[PDB]
Amino acid sequence: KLPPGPSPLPVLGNLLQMDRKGLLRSFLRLREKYGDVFTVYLGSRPVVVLCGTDAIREALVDQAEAFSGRGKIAVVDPIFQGYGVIFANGERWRALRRFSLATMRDRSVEERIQEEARCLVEELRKSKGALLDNTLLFHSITSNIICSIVFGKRFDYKDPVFLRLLDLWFQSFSLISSFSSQVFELFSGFLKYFPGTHRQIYRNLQEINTFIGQSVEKHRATLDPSNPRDFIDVYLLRMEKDKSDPSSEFHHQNLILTVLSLFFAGTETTSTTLRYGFLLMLKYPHVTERVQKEIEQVIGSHRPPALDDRAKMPYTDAVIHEIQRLGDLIPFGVPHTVTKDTQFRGYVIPKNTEVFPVLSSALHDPRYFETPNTFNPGHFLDANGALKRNEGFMPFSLGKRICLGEGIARTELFLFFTTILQNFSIASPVPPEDIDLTPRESGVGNVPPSYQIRFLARH
Numbered sequence: 001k002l003p004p005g006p007s008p009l010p011v012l013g014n015l016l017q018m019d020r021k022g023l024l025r026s027f028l029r030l031r032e033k034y035g036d037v038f039t040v041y042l043g044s045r046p047v048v049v050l051c052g053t054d055a056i057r058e059a060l061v062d063q064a065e066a067f068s069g070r071g072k073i074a075v076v077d078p079i080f081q082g083y084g085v086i087f088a089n090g091e092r093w094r095a096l097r098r099f100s101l102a103t104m105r106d107r108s109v110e111e112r113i114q115e116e117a118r119c120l121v122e123e124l125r126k127s128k129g130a131l132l133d134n135t136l137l138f139h140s141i142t143s144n145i146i147c148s149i150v151f152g153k154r155f156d157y158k159d160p161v162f163l164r165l166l167d168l169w170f171q172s173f174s175l176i177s178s179f180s181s182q183v184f185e186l187f188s189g190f191l192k193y194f195p196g197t198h199r200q201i202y203r204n205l206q207e208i209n210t211f212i213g214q215s216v217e218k219h220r221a222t223l224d225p226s227n228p229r230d231f232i233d234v235y236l237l238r239m240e241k242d243k244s245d246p247s248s249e250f251h252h253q254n255l256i257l258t259v260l261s262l263f264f265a266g267t268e269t270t271s272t273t274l275r276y277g278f279l280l281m282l283k284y285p286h287v288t289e290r291v292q293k294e295i296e297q298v299i300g301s302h303r304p305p306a307l308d309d310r311a312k313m314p315y316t317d318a319v320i321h322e323i324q325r326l327g328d329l330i331p332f333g334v335p336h337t338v339t340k341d342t343q344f345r346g347y348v349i350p351k352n353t354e355v356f357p358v359l360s361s362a363l364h365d366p367r368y369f370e371t372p373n374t375f376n377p378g379h380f381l382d383a384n385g386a387l388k389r390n391e392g393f394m395p396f397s398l399g400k401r402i403c404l405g406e407g408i409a410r411t412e413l414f415l416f417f418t419t420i421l422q423n424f425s426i427a428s429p430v431p432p433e434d435i436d437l438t439p440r441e442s443g444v445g446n447v448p449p450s451y452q453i454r455f456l457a458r459h
């Protein structure tokens with residue numbers, strides 16, 4: 001009754017029908033054969049794979065609650081163990097999500113993003129126009145924003161202890177997108193006994209948990225229940241309220257893992273999107289010029305951009321949409337499960353079967369985008385130059401599990417891109433026609449080639 005596919009071997013499942021290139025290539029290749037909705041055995045796990053906008057919208061939107069389950073990621077589960085906002089299920093997840101969503105909604109995020117943008121620009125000025133790899137600074141700005149939500153403070157770009165933690169934090173993401181972590185996904189049950197990247201990822205995340213732990217103790221020692229400082233204070237106050245209710249999800253472990261969860265989901269993606277954006281802006285100066293004129297028209301050279309400006313800036317907004325679409329940072333999504341026995345396009349997905357919504361195949365869907373493989377902001381502009389947003393576009397995914405940080409994420413993109421370009425034009429040792437957009441490391445995260453850039457102060 002499950003969707004069609006290749007016949008598993010016991011233990012090894014569909015290994016022999018997969019592709020050396022990795023999971024995504026594996027999935028797209030099977031789709032050719034079996035259509036938009038097939039079953040692949042990873043290890044001995046059946047997994048149902050959703051391809052194309054329509055099949056995805058059909059599960060995540062038309063059957064929102066069936067498909068609201070969350071799956072495991074083999075390399076990080078030893079850490080999260082189903083705790084915290086991302087990997088929680090059922091009542092745990094509702095409580096954590098509802099809580100998180102409200103807490104981060106309540107200085108405003110926009111104000112903090114603005115002030116971060118100002119530090120960033122102040123920093124770039126110092127270089128005086130020197131070649132520069134922007135990965136570190138982009139890591140720094142994105143982590144700072146989470147740090148201010150979570151810890152109620154930010155770090156200076158040259159702070160060495162901060163940079164030490166950043167180094168290991170970010171080194172974890174490439175390890176998670178590594179080929180061998182993909183292999184670990186399939187045969188962790190065997191491979192968890194031997195050395196591998198799973199142990200490095202474990203150590204790295206735990207080091208970060210420990211840091212979080214200390215921050216929590218310090219938060220409590222200093223707490224003023226009248227004026228909550230950040231997410232941690234607000235969580236502590238809710239721990240206290242639930243002191244005498246043992247069925248409450250508001251314990252210490254969900255506190256550490258939720259804070260980690262926010263770092264885990266809101267740093268590398270946003271940071272890389274930014275870095276991909278600038279790689280596209282080096283490649284297509286005609287676009288970057290256009291965005292700068294649009295900034296000149298709407299904002300001018302003087303005040304900082306604010307979120308308000310975006311709705312008056314359709315071309316930029318279209319460009320940012322197009323950056324995320326092409327960037328394609330999480331290409332087969334974050335695993336789901338079905339909360340119950342599900343009827344789907346003729347098939348039956350047993351309760352707790354895993355679903356992979358192949359987001360990439362939306363972002364590249366030729367029904368919705370004329371030139372799926374070309375950077376064309378056109379995909380988001382109608383005949384009047386107004387922004388039109390389409391069904392193809394789903395980089396934060398859809399339905400009940402939609403990115404819990406969508407608004408934060410988009411605000412960072414809009415305000416970082418627009419505050420930077422407002423003060424800087426850009427250039428690079430590599431000619432635009434020679435710039436290559438093909439990712440170096442592809443996994444649960446895509447990763448674009450590293451490059452150098454100059455941020456040249458304007459007028």
Ligand code: HEM
Pocket residue numbers: 070085086087097146261262265266267269270273329330333334335359395396397398400401402403404405406408409
């Ligand atoms: C460019 C930036 C980002 C992108 C492309 C992105 C994308 C996504 C995607 C594809 C998912 C999976 C939803 C699903 O399971 O189907 C997700 C989940 C999530 N995101 Fe993001 N995200 C971004 C930034 C952030 C930020 C800044 C935060 C918080 C500060 C955040 C917090 C979360 C959380 C907590 C989840 C799990 C949601 C849940 O299970 O209920 N994300 N994100």
Ligand SMILES: OC[C@H]1O[C@H](O[C@H]2[C@H](O)[C@@H](O)[C@H](OCCCCCC3CCCCC3)O[C@@H]2CO)[C@H](O)[C@@H](O)[C@@H]1O
Pocket residue numbers: 015016017018019020021022023026182183186
């Ligand atoms: O001429 C090609 C010959 O090679 C074939 O090998 C299969 C090979 O047996 C098979 O090993 C190759 O699969 C690649 C191995 C997949 C492992 C990679 C996975 C690692 C984890 C995450 C990504 C996927 O795919 C081929 C598809 O045909 C078959 O052995 C033959 O029938 C065929 O004639």
Ligand SMILES: OC[C@H]1O[C@H](O[C@H]2[C@H](O)[C@@H](O)[C@H](OCCCCCC3CCCCC3)O[C@@H]2CO)[C@H](O)[C@@H](O)[C@@H]1O
Pocket residue numbers: 143147155161162165166169208211263267
């Ligand atoms: O005498 C010691 C003095 O140093 C303190 O600095 C602390 C800071 O208060 C404490 O916040 C700092 O943290 C730096 C690491 C921040 C890492 C956050 C990362 C998490 C993952 C993603 C990247 C960001 O560790 C420092 C260790 O010294 C404080 O500056 C002073 O209050 C204190 O008196």
